[PDB]
Short mmCIF file of N, CA and C in Angstrom, two decimals:
data_model
loop_
_atom_site.label_atom_id
_atom_site.label_comp_id
_atom_site.label_asym_id
_atom_site.label_seq_id
_atom_site.Cartn_x
_atom_site.Cartn_y
_atom_site.Cartn_z
N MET M 1 0.84 -1.24 0.00
CA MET M 1 0.00 0.00 0.00
C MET M 1 0.86 1.26 0.00
N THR M 2 0.96 1.92 -1.16
CA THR M 2 1.65 3.21 -1.27
C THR M 2 0.91 4.32 -0.48
N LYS M 3 1.54 5.50 -0.37
CA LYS M 3 0.94 6.61 0.36
C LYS M 3 -0.36 7.08 -0.31
N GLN M 4 -0.30 7.28 -1.62
CA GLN M 4 -1.45 7.72 -2.41
C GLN M 4 -2.61 6.71 -2.40
N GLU M 5 -2.29 5.42 -2.48
CA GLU M 5 -3.28 4.35 -2.37
C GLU M 5 -4.06 4.38 -1.04
N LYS M 6 -3.33 4.46 0.07
CA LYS M 6 -3.93 4.55 1.41
C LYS M 6 -4.85 5.77 1.54
N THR M 7 -4.35 6.94 1.10
CA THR M 7 -5.13 8.20 1.11
C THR M 7 -6.43 8.08 0.33
N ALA M 8 -6.36 7.52 -0.87
CA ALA M 8 -7.54 7.31 -1.70
C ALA M 8 -8.55 6.46 -0.93
N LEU M 9 -8.05 5.43 -0.23
CA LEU M 9 -8.86 4.55 0.60
C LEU M 9 -9.53 5.25 1.79
N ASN M 10 -8.74 5.91 2.62
CA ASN M 10 -9.24 6.78 3.69
C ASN M 10 -10.30 7.73 3.14
N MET M 11 -9.99 8.42 2.05
CA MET M 11 -10.94 9.38 1.51
C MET M 11 -12.28 8.76 1.07
N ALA M 12 -12.23 7.64 0.32
CA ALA M 12 -13.42 6.94 -0.15
C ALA M 12 -14.28 6.38 1.03
N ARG M 13 -13.65 5.70 1.98
CA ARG M 13 -14.27 5.26 3.24
C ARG M 13 -14.94 6.41 4.03
N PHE M 14 -14.27 7.55 4.15
CA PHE M 14 -14.82 8.63 4.92
C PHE M 14 -16.03 9.14 4.22
N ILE M 15 -15.94 9.24 2.88
CA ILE M 15 -17.03 9.79 2.10
C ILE M 15 -18.19 8.84 2.14
N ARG M 16 -17.90 7.54 2.04
CA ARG M 16 -18.98 6.54 2.16
C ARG M 16 -19.74 6.69 3.47
N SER M 17 -19.01 6.80 4.56
CA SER M 17 -19.60 6.94 5.88
C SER M 17 -20.28 8.32 6.09
N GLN M 18 -19.65 9.41 5.67
CA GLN M 18 -20.27 10.74 5.77
C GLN M 18 -21.56 10.89 4.91
N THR M 19 -21.67 10.19 3.78
CA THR M 19 -22.93 10.30 3.00
C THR M 19 -24.12 9.66 3.70
N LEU M 20 -23.87 8.62 4.50
CA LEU M 20 -24.93 8.05 5.32
C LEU M 20 -25.37 9.03 6.38
N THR M 21 -24.43 9.75 6.94
CA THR M 21 -24.75 10.77 7.92
C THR M 21 -25.59 11.88 7.30
N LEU M 22 -25.17 12.33 6.13
CA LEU M 22 -25.89 13.39 5.46
C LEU M 22 -27.31 12.93 5.17
N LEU M 23 -27.49 11.69 4.72
CA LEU M 23 -28.83 11.17 4.39
C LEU M 23 -29.69 11.18 5.65
N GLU M 24 -29.18 10.57 6.72
CA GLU M 24 -29.89 10.65 8.00
C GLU M 24 -30.23 12.09 8.42
N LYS M 25 -29.33 13.04 8.22
CA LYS M 25 -29.60 14.44 8.56
C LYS M 25 -30.70 15.04 7.68
N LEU M 26 -30.83 14.50 6.47
CA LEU M 26 -31.87 14.93 5.55
C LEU M 26 -33.23 14.44 6.03
N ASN M 27 -33.29 13.20 6.49
CA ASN M 27 -34.50 12.68 7.14
C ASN M 27 -34.99 13.62 8.24
N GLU M 28 -34.08 14.19 9.02
CA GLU M 28 -34.48 15.13 10.07
C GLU M 28 -35.01 16.44 9.48
N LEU M 29 -34.41 16.93 8.42
CA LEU M 29 -34.90 18.16 7.80
C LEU M 29 -36.30 17.98 7.19
N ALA M 30 -36.57 16.79 6.67
CA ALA M 30 -37.82 16.48 6.01
C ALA M 30 -38.93 16.47 7.05
N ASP M 31 -38.62 15.93 8.22
CA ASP M 31 -39.54 15.95 9.35
C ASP M 31 -39.83 17.36 9.74
N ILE M 32 -38.84 18.23 9.81
CA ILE M 32 -39.18 19.61 10.15
C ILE M 32 -40.00 20.25 9.07
N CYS M 33 -39.65 19.97 7.81
CA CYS M 33 -40.35 20.61 6.69
C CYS M 33 -41.81 20.22 6.63
N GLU M 34 -42.10 18.95 6.87
CA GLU M 34 -43.47 18.48 6.88
C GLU M 34 -44.27 19.09 8.01
N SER M 35 -43.66 19.21 9.19
CA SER M 35 -44.33 19.88 10.30
C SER M 35 -44.59 21.37 9.98
N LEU M 36 -43.64 22.01 9.33
CA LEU M 36 -43.81 23.40 8.84
C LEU M 36 -44.95 23.52 7.85
N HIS M 37 -45.00 22.60 6.90
CA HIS M 37 -46.13 22.56 5.99
C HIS M 37 -47.50 22.40 6.67
N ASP M 38 -47.64 21.42 7.58
CA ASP M 38 -48.89 21.24 8.34
C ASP M 38 -49.25 22.49 9.16
N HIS M 39 -48.29 23.13 9.80
CA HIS M 39 -48.59 24.38 10.49
C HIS M 39 -49.00 25.53 9.50
N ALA M 40 -48.28 25.67 8.40
CA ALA M 40 -48.67 26.62 7.31
C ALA M 40 -50.07 26.38 6.74
N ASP M 41 -50.43 25.13 6.58
CA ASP M 41 -51.76 24.83 6.13
C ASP M 41 -52.81 25.22 7.16
N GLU M 42 -52.59 24.92 8.45
CA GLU M 42 -53.54 25.31 9.49
C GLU M 42 -53.60 26.84 9.61
N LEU M 43 -52.45 27.48 9.47
CA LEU M 43 -52.35 28.95 9.43
C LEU M 43 -53.25 29.52 8.29
N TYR M 44 -53.13 28.97 7.10
CA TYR M 44 -53.89 29.46 5.95
C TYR M 44 -55.39 29.27 6.17
N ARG M 45 -55.79 28.07 6.55
CA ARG M 45 -57.19 27.76 6.77
C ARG M 45 -57.81 28.55 7.93
N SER M 46 -57.01 28.85 8.94
CA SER M 46 -57.41 29.77 10.01
C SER M 46 -57.61 31.20 9.47
N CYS M 47 -56.71 31.63 8.60
CA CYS M 47 -56.86 32.95 7.99
C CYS M 47 -58.09 33.00 7.08
N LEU M 48 -58.34 31.95 6.31
CA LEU M 48 -59.51 31.91 5.43
C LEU M 48 -60.79 32.05 6.26
N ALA M 49 -60.89 31.25 7.32
CA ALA M 49 -62.02 31.28 8.25
C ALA M 49 -62.25 32.66 8.89
N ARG M 50 -61.17 33.39 9.14
CA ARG M 50 -61.26 34.75 9.68
C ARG M 50 -61.92 35.69 8.67
N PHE M 51 -61.22 35.93 7.56
CA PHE M 51 -61.55 36.94 6.55
C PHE M 51 -62.73 36.53 5.66
N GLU E 5 -55.83 43.54 5.49
CA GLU E 5 -56.45 42.24 5.91
C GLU E 5 -56.52 41.19 4.79
N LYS E 6 -56.57 41.67 3.54
CA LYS E 6 -56.49 40.80 2.36
C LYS E 6 -55.06 40.28 2.14
N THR E 7 -54.07 41.00 2.68
CA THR E 7 -52.66 40.65 2.49
C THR E 7 -52.13 39.63 3.49
N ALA E 8 -52.70 39.59 4.70
CA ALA E 8 -52.37 38.56 5.68
C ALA E 8 -52.77 37.17 5.15
N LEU E 9 -53.85 37.14 4.37
CA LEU E 9 -54.27 35.90 3.77
C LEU E 9 -53.39 35.52 2.55
N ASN E 10 -53.03 36.50 1.71
CA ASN E 10 -52.05 36.29 0.63
C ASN E 10 -50.66 35.87 1.15
N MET E 11 -50.27 36.40 2.31
CA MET E 11 -49.03 36.00 2.99
C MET E 11 -49.04 34.55 3.48
N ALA E 12 -50.15 34.15 4.11
CA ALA E 12 -50.28 32.78 4.65
C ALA E 12 -50.26 31.77 3.52
N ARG E 13 -50.89 32.09 2.39
CA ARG E 13 -50.91 31.18 1.25
C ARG E 13 -49.49 31.06 0.66
N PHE E 14 -48.77 32.17 0.63
CA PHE E 14 -47.40 32.17 0.12
C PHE E 14 -46.46 31.31 1.01
N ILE E 15 -46.59 31.43 2.32
CA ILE E 15 -45.78 30.60 3.21
C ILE E 15 -46.10 29.13 3.03
N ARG E 16 -47.39 28.80 2.86
CA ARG E 16 -47.75 27.40 2.61
C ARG E 16 -47.13 26.82 1.33
N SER E 17 -47.09 27.62 0.26
CA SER E 17 -46.55 27.14 -1.01
C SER E 17 -45.01 27.04 -0.98
N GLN E 18 -44.35 28.00 -0.35
CA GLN E 18 -42.91 27.86 -0.09
C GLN E 18 -42.49 26.59 0.69
N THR E 19 -43.30 26.10 1.63
CA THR E 19 -42.92 24.84 2.35
C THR E 19 -43.02 23.63 1.42
N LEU E 20 -43.94 23.68 0.46
CA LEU E 20 -44.02 22.65 -0.61
C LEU E 20 -42.81 22.68 -1.51
N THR E 21 -42.36 23.87 -1.85
CA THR E 21 -41.12 23.99 -2.60
C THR E 21 -39.92 23.46 -1.81
N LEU E 22 -39.88 23.74 -0.51
CA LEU E 22 -38.83 23.21 0.35
C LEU E 22 -38.75 21.69 0.26
N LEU E 23 -39.88 21.03 0.41
CA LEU E 23 -39.97 19.57 0.41
C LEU E 23 -39.41 19.00 -0.87
N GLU E 24 -39.83 19.56 -1.99
CA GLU E 24 -39.35 19.15 -3.29
C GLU E 24 -37.85 19.31 -3.42
N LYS E 25 -37.31 20.44 -2.97
CA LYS E 25 -35.88 20.63 -3.05
C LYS E 25 -35.14 19.66 -2.13
N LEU E 26 -35.75 19.25 -1.02
CA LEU E 26 -35.03 18.35 -0.12
C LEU E 26 -34.92 16.98 -0.74
N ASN E 27 -35.96 16.57 -1.45
CA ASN E 27 -35.96 15.28 -2.12
C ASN E 27 -34.89 15.22 -3.19
N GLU E 28 -34.64 16.35 -3.84
CA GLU E 28 -33.62 16.42 -4.88
C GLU E 28 -32.22 16.39 -4.24
N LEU E 29 -32.07 16.99 -3.08
CA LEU E 29 -30.85 16.87 -2.35
C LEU E 29 -30.62 15.40 -1.94
N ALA E 30 -31.69 14.70 -1.59
CA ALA E 30 -31.56 13.35 -1.08
C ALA E 30 -31.14 12.38 -2.19
N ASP E 31 -31.69 12.57 -3.39
CA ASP E 31 -31.29 11.88 -4.61
C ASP E 31 -29.81 12.06 -4.90
N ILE E 32 -29.32 13.29 -4.78
CA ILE E 32 -27.90 13.58 -5.01
C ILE E 32 -27.09 12.86 -3.95
N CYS E 33 -27.53 12.91 -2.69
CA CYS E 33 -26.82 12.22 -1.62
C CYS E 33 -26.72 10.70 -1.78
N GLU E 34 -27.78 10.05 -2.23
CA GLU E 34 -27.71 8.60 -2.36
C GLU E 34 -26.88 8.15 -3.56
N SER E 35 -26.97 8.89 -4.64
CA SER E 35 -26.05 8.77 -5.74
C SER E 35 -24.60 8.96 -5.29
N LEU E 36 -24.32 9.96 -4.46
CA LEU E 36 -22.94 10.17 -4.03
C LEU E 36 -22.54 8.96 -3.23
N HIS E 37 -23.43 8.53 -2.35
CA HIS E 37 -23.14 7.37 -1.51
C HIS E 37 -22.85 6.13 -2.36
N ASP E 38 -23.66 5.88 -3.38
CA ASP E 38 -23.51 4.68 -4.21
C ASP E 38 -22.16 4.70 -4.98
N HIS E 39 -21.76 5.87 -5.45
CA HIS E 39 -20.47 5.99 -6.12
C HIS E 39 -19.32 5.89 -5.16
N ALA E 40 -19.48 6.48 -3.96
CA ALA E 40 -18.45 6.37 -2.95
C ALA E 40 -18.24 4.90 -2.63
N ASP E 41 -19.32 4.16 -2.52
CA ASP E 41 -19.26 2.74 -2.13
C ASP E 41 -18.60 1.87 -3.20
N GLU E 42 -18.93 2.12 -4.47
CA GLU E 42 -18.36 1.41 -5.60
C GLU E 42 -16.84 1.66 -5.66
N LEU E 43 -16.44 2.92 -5.58
CA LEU E 43 -15.03 3.31 -5.59
C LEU E 43 -14.27 2.65 -4.42
N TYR E 44 -14.81 2.76 -3.20
CA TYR E 44 -14.24 2.07 -2.05
C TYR E 44 -13.99 0.56 -2.28
N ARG E 45 -14.99 -0.15 -2.77
CA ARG E 45 -14.89 -1.59 -2.98
C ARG E 45 -13.82 -1.94 -3.98
N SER E 46 -13.79 -1.20 -5.08
CA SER E 46 -12.88 -1.48 -6.16
C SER E 46 -11.45 -1.02 -5.81
N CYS E 47 -11.33 -0.06 -4.89
CA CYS E 47 -10.04 0.25 -4.26
C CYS E 47 -9.61 -0.84 -3.26
N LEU E 48 -10.53 -1.30 -2.42
CA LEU E 48 -10.20 -2.35 -1.47
C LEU E 48 -9.87 -3.67 -2.18
N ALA E 49 -10.30 -3.80 -3.43
CA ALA E 49 -10.01 -4.98 -4.24
C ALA E 49 -8.61 -4.91 -4.82
N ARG E 50 -8.24 -3.75 -5.35
CA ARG E 50 -6.99 -3.58 -6.06
C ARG E 50 -5.78 -3.46 -5.12
N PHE E 51 -5.98 -2.95 -3.92
CA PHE E 51 -4.85 -2.68 -3.02
C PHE E 51 -4.88 -3.61 -1.80
N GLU B 5 -8.81 0.89 -14.48
CA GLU B 5 -7.97 1.88 -13.73
C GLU B 5 -8.20 3.34 -14.17
N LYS B 6 -8.62 3.52 -15.42
CA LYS B 6 -9.01 4.83 -15.94
C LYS B 6 -10.38 5.26 -15.40
N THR B 7 -11.19 4.29 -14.96
CA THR B 7 -12.54 4.56 -14.47
C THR B 7 -12.61 4.93 -12.99
N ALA B 8 -11.66 4.45 -12.19
CA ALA B 8 -11.54 4.86 -10.78
C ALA B 8 -11.23 6.36 -10.70
N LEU B 9 -10.48 6.85 -11.68
CA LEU B 9 -10.17 8.27 -11.73
C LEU B 9 -11.38 9.09 -12.24
N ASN B 10 -12.09 8.60 -13.26
CA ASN B 10 -13.36 9.21 -13.71
C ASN B 10 -14.45 9.21 -12.61
N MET B 11 -14.47 8.16 -11.79
CA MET B 11 -15.36 8.08 -10.62
C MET B 11 -15.05 9.12 -9.55
N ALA B 12 -13.76 9.27 -9.22
CA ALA B 12 -13.33 10.22 -8.18
C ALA B 12 -13.65 11.64 -8.61
N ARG B 13 -13.47 11.95 -9.90
CA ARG B 13 -13.77 13.29 -10.40
C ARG B 13 -15.28 13.55 -10.34
N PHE B 14 -16.06 12.53 -10.64
CA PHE B 14 -17.52 12.65 -10.59
C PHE B 14 -18.02 12.90 -9.14
N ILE B 15 -17.46 12.18 -8.18
CA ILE B 15 -17.84 12.42 -6.78
C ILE B 15 -17.47 13.82 -6.35
N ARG B 16 -16.30 14.30 -6.77
CA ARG B 16 -15.92 15.68 -6.43
C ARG B 16 -16.88 16.74 -6.99
N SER B 17 -17.36 16.54 -8.22
CA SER B 17 -18.26 17.51 -8.84
C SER B 17 -19.67 17.45 -8.24
N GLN B 18 -20.16 16.25 -7.96
CA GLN B 18 -21.41 16.12 -7.19
C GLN B 18 -21.42 16.83 -5.82
N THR B 19 -20.30 16.89 -5.10
CA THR B 19 -20.30 17.62 -3.78
C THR B 19 -20.42 19.13 -4.01
N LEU B 20 -19.88 19.63 -5.12
CA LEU B 20 -20.08 21.04 -5.53
C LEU B 20 -21.53 21.33 -5.86
N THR B 21 -22.18 20.41 -6.55
CA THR B 21 -23.60 20.55 -6.79
C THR B 21 -24.40 20.53 -5.49
N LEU B 22 -24.02 19.66 -4.55
CA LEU B 22 -24.67 19.63 -3.24
C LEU B 22 -24.64 21.00 -2.57
N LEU B 23 -23.47 21.61 -2.53
CA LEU B 23 -23.26 22.89 -1.87
C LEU B 23 -24.17 23.96 -2.45
N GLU B 24 -24.20 24.03 -3.77
CA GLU B 24 -25.06 24.96 -4.47
C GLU B 24 -26.52 24.75 -4.13
N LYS B 25 -26.97 23.50 -4.11
CA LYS B 25 -28.35 23.24 -3.78
C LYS B 25 -28.65 23.58 -2.32
N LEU B 26 -27.66 23.48 -1.43
CA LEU B 26 -27.96 23.77 -0.04
C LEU B 26 -28.14 25.26 0.14
N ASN B 27 -27.38 26.05 -0.60
CA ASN B 27 -27.48 27.50 -0.53
C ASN B 27 -28.85 27.96 -1.00
N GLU B 28 -29.41 27.25 -1.98
CA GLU B 28 -30.72 27.59 -2.51
C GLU B 28 -31.81 27.19 -1.50
N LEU B 29 -31.60 26.10 -0.79
CA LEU B 29 -32.49 25.76 0.28
C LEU B 29 -32.44 26.83 1.38
N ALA B 30 -31.26 27.38 1.63
CA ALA B 30 -31.08 28.31 2.73
C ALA B 30 -31.76 29.65 2.43
N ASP B 31 -31.67 30.09 1.17
CA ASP B 31 -32.40 31.24 0.65
C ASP B 31 -33.91 31.09 0.83
N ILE B 32 -34.43 29.90 0.51
CA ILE B 32 -35.86 29.63 0.68
C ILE B 32 -36.20 29.69 2.15
N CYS B 33 -35.36 29.10 3.01
CA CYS B 33 -35.60 29.13 4.44
C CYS B 33 -35.62 30.53 5.07
N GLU B 34 -34.72 31.41 4.65
CA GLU B 34 -34.70 32.73 5.24
C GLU B 34 -35.84 33.62 4.77
N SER B 35 -36.20 33.49 3.51
CA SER B 35 -37.42 34.04 2.99
C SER B 35 -38.64 33.53 3.76
N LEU B 36 -38.71 32.23 4.06
CA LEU B 36 -39.87 31.72 4.78
C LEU B 36 -39.87 32.36 6.13
N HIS B 37 -38.69 32.41 6.75
CA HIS B 37 -38.57 33.01 8.07
C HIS B 37 -39.03 34.47 8.07
N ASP B 38 -38.59 35.24 7.09
CA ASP B 38 -38.91 36.67 7.03
C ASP B 38 -40.44 36.89 6.86
N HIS B 39 -41.08 36.06 6.05
CA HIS B 39 -42.52 36.16 5.89
C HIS B 39 -43.27 35.68 7.12
N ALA B 40 -42.76 34.62 7.75
CA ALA B 40 -43.37 34.15 8.98
C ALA B 40 -43.33 35.26 10.01
N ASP B 41 -42.21 35.96 10.08
CA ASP B 41 -42.01 37.01 11.08
C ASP B 41 -42.91 38.22 10.85
N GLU B 42 -43.06 38.63 9.59
CA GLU B 42 -43.92 39.73 9.20
C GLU B 42 -45.38 39.41 9.55
N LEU B 43 -45.84 38.23 9.15
CA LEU B 43 -47.19 37.77 9.44
C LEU B 43 -47.45 37.73 10.96
N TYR B 44 -46.54 37.11 11.72
CA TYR B 44 -46.62 37.12 13.18
C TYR B 44 -46.80 38.52 13.79
N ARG B 45 -45.96 39.47 13.38
CA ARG B 45 -46.00 40.82 13.93
C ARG B 45 -47.31 41.51 13.65
N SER B 46 -47.78 41.37 12.42
CA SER B 46 -48.98 42.05 11.98
C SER B 46 -50.24 41.35 12.54
N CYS B 47 -50.12 40.07 12.87
CA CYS B 47 -51.14 39.38 13.67
C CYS B 47 -51.10 39.83 15.14
N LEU B 48 -49.92 39.92 15.74
CA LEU B 48 -49.80 40.36 17.11
C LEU B 48 -50.24 41.82 17.28
N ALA B 49 -50.26 42.56 16.17
CA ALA B 49 -50.70 43.95 16.17
C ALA B 49 -52.21 44.05 16.14
N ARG B 50 -52.84 43.24 15.29
CA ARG B 50 -54.27 43.32 15.07
C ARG B 50 -55.09 42.67 16.18
N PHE B 51 -54.54 41.66 16.85
CA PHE B 51 -55.32 40.90 17.84
C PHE B 51 -54.79 41.14 19.25
N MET Y 1 -59.74 37.70 21.55
CA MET Y 1 -59.06 36.69 20.68
C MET Y 1 -59.98 35.51 20.37
N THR Y 2 -60.52 35.48 19.15
CA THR Y 2 -61.32 34.34 18.69
C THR Y 2 -60.46 33.05 18.55
N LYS Y 3 -61.12 31.91 18.30
CA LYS Y 3 -60.41 30.64 18.17
C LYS Y 3 -59.46 30.66 16.96
N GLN Y 4 -59.98 31.10 15.81
CA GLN Y 4 -59.21 31.20 14.58
C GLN Y 4 -58.03 32.18 14.66
N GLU Y 5 -58.25 33.32 15.32
CA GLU Y 5 -57.19 34.30 15.57
C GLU Y 5 -56.01 33.71 16.38
N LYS Y 6 -56.32 33.05 17.50
CA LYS Y 6 -55.31 32.39 18.33
C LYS Y 6 -54.51 31.34 17.54
N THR Y 7 -55.23 30.47 16.81
CA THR Y 7 -54.62 29.44 15.95
C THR Y 7 -53.65 30.02 14.93
N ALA Y 8 -54.07 31.08 14.25
CA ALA Y 8 -53.23 31.75 13.27
C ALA Y 8 -51.95 32.23 13.96
N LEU Y 9 -52.09 32.75 15.17
CA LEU Y 9 -50.97 33.21 15.99
C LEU Y 9 -50.00 32.10 16.40
N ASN Y 10 -50.52 31.05 17.04
CA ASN Y 10 -49.76 29.83 17.32
C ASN Y 10 -49.04 29.35 16.07
N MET Y 11 -49.76 29.24 14.95
CA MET Y 11 -49.15 28.73 13.74
C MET Y 11 -47.99 29.60 13.22
N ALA Y 12 -48.19 30.93 13.15
CA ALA Y 12 -47.17 31.87 12.70
C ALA Y 12 -45.91 31.88 13.63
N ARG Y 13 -46.12 31.98 14.94
CA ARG Y 13 -45.07 31.82 15.95
C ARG Y 13 -44.28 30.50 15.83
N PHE Y 14 -44.97 29.38 15.61
CA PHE Y 14 -44.28 28.12 15.54
C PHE Y 14 -43.43 28.11 14.32
N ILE Y 15 -43.98 28.65 13.22
CA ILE Y 15 -43.28 28.64 11.95
C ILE Y 15 -42.09 29.55 12.04
N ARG Y 16 -42.28 30.71 12.67
CA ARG Y 16 -41.14 31.62 12.87
C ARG Y 16 -40.00 30.94 13.60
N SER Y 17 -40.32 30.27 14.69
CA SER Y 17 -39.33 29.57 15.49
C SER Y 17 -38.74 28.32 14.78
N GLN Y 18 -39.58 27.51 14.14
CA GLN Y 18 -39.08 26.35 13.38
C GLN Y 18 -38.18 26.75 12.17
N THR Y 19 -38.40 27.90 11.54
CA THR Y 19 -37.49 28.28 10.43
C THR Y 19 -36.08 28.62 10.90
N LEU Y 20 -35.95 29.13 12.12
CA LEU Y 20 -34.64 29.34 12.69
C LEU Y 20 -33.95 28.02 12.94
N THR Y 21 -34.70 27.03 13.38
CA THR Y 21 -34.15 25.71 13.59
C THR Y 21 -33.68 25.11 12.27
N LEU Y 22 -34.51 25.22 11.24
CA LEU Y 22 -34.16 24.68 9.96
C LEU Y 22 -32.89 25.34 9.46
N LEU Y 23 -32.76 26.66 9.62
CA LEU Y 23 -31.58 27.39 9.14
C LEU Y 23 -30.34 26.86 9.86
N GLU Y 24 -30.40 26.84 11.20
CA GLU Y 24 -29.31 26.23 11.96
C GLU Y 24 -28.97 24.80 11.50
N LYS Y 25 -29.97 23.98 11.19
CA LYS Y 25 -29.72 22.62 10.72
C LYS Y 25 -29.05 22.61 9.35
N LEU Y 26 -29.30 23.67 8.57
CA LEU Y 26 -28.68 23.81 7.26
C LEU Y 26 -27.19 24.14 7.42
N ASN Y 27 -26.87 25.01 8.36
CA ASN Y 27 -25.47 25.27 8.72
C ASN Y 27 -24.72 23.97 9.01
N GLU Y 28 -25.35 23.02 9.68
CA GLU Y 28 -24.71 21.74 9.95
C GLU Y 28 -24.53 20.91 8.68
N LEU Y 29 -25.50 20.93 7.78
CA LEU Y 29 -25.36 20.19 6.54
C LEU Y 29 -24.24 20.76 5.65
N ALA Y 30 -24.06 22.07 5.69
CA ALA Y 30 -23.08 22.77 4.88
C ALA Y 30 -21.69 22.38 5.36
N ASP Y 31 -21.53 22.28 6.66
CA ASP Y 31 -20.29 21.80 7.25
C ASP Y 31 -20.01 20.41 6.81
N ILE Y 32 -20.99 19.53 6.79
CA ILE Y 32 -20.67 18.18 6.30
C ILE Y 32 -20.34 18.21 4.84
N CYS Y 33 -21.07 19.02 4.07
CA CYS Y 33 -20.86 19.05 2.62
C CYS Y 33 -19.47 19.54 2.26
N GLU Y 34 -19.01 20.58 2.95
CA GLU Y 34 -17.67 21.11 2.71
C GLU Y 34 -16.60 20.10 3.08
N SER Y 35 -16.78 19.39 4.18
CA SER Y 35 -15.83 18.34 4.54
C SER Y 35 -15.83 17.20 3.49
N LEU Y 36 -17.00 16.86 2.97
CA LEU Y 36 -17.13 15.89 1.87
C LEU Y 36 -16.41 16.36 0.61
N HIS Y 37 -16.60 17.62 0.26
CA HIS Y 37 -15.85 18.18 -0.84
C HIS Y 37 -14.32 18.12 -0.68
N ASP Y 38 -13.80 18.57 0.47
CA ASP Y 38 -12.35 18.47 0.75
C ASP Y 38 -11.85 17.02 0.70
N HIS Y 39 -12.58 16.08 1.25
CA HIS Y 39 -12.18 14.68 1.11
C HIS Y 39 -12.23 14.18 -0.38
N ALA Y 40 -13.30 14.51 -1.09
CA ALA Y 40 -13.38 14.22 -2.56
C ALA Y 40 -12.25 14.83 -3.38
N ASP Y 41 -11.86 16.03 -3.05
CA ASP Y 41 -10.74 16.63 -3.73
C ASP Y 41 -9.44 15.89 -3.43
N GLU Y 42 -9.18 15.53 -2.17
CA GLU Y 42 -7.96 14.78 -1.82
C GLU Y 42 -8.00 13.38 -2.47
N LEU Y 43 -9.19 12.78 -2.50
CA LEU Y 43 -9.43 11.51 -3.19
C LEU Y 43 -9.03 11.62 -4.69
N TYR Y 44 -9.50 12.67 -5.36
CA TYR Y 44 -9.22 12.85 -6.78
C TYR Y 44 -7.72 13.04 -7.03
N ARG Y 45 -7.11 13.95 -6.28
CA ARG Y 45 -5.70 14.24 -6.44
C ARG Y 45 -4.80 13.05 -6.08
N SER Y 46 -5.22 12.24 -5.12
CA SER Y 46 -4.57 10.97 -4.83
C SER Y 46 -4.69 9.99 -6.01
N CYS Y 47 -5.87 9.94 -6.62
CA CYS Y 47 -6.05 9.08 -7.78
C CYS Y 47 -5.22 9.58 -8.97
N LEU Y 48 -5.15 10.88 -9.19
CA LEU Y 48 -4.35 11.44 -10.28
C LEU Y 48 -2.89 11.04 -10.11
N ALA Y 49 -2.36 11.24 -8.90
CA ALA Y 49 -0.99 10.88 -8.55
C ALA Y 49 -0.68 9.39 -8.75
N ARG Y 50 -1.66 8.53 -8.53
CA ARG Y 50 -1.52 7.10 -8.77
C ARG Y 50 -1.33 6.81 -10.26
N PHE Y 51 -2.39 7.06 -11.03
CA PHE Y 51 -2.50 6.68 -12.44
C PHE Y 51 -1.67 7.57 -13.37
#
């Protein structure tokens, strides 16, 4: 294993593992976004009922 | 009073746009993951 | 061996695309925030 | 404060507060993305040096 070979390996492994983290973090953003949408919808329908 | 209702509708439609953009980010992320994984395996094979 | 290098270049360019898309999500988020804040204030004023 | 008025208020306040959370969560994703980019760049330059 040359220096460049090992580095390429470290880099690919880290990226493989960090993309799973990013995906999981996206799941969390989607949950917030959906809750924001449901609140926005109740907000709109409350405003419609007012005016 | 007509504008508070136009504002609420606008916020509702922007959250729909958010959702769509997140799904496109997620597609890019899984593609990156799949390529990272392929490259890793074929590196772990050769070295 | 020519394809491991084409793969690495592709992963690098996809992370640049990721960054750009995140900035566009962030623009949408701050806009949503600014409208949410305006609506809140003008509601807290009227009621 | 009518029922619809209060709801509109709750909804707008929650959305105001949740958008700050989303923004902060985006800051975290950007940090991961930049680290992914730096690793991808080292990966590429390591591969160039190899081949």
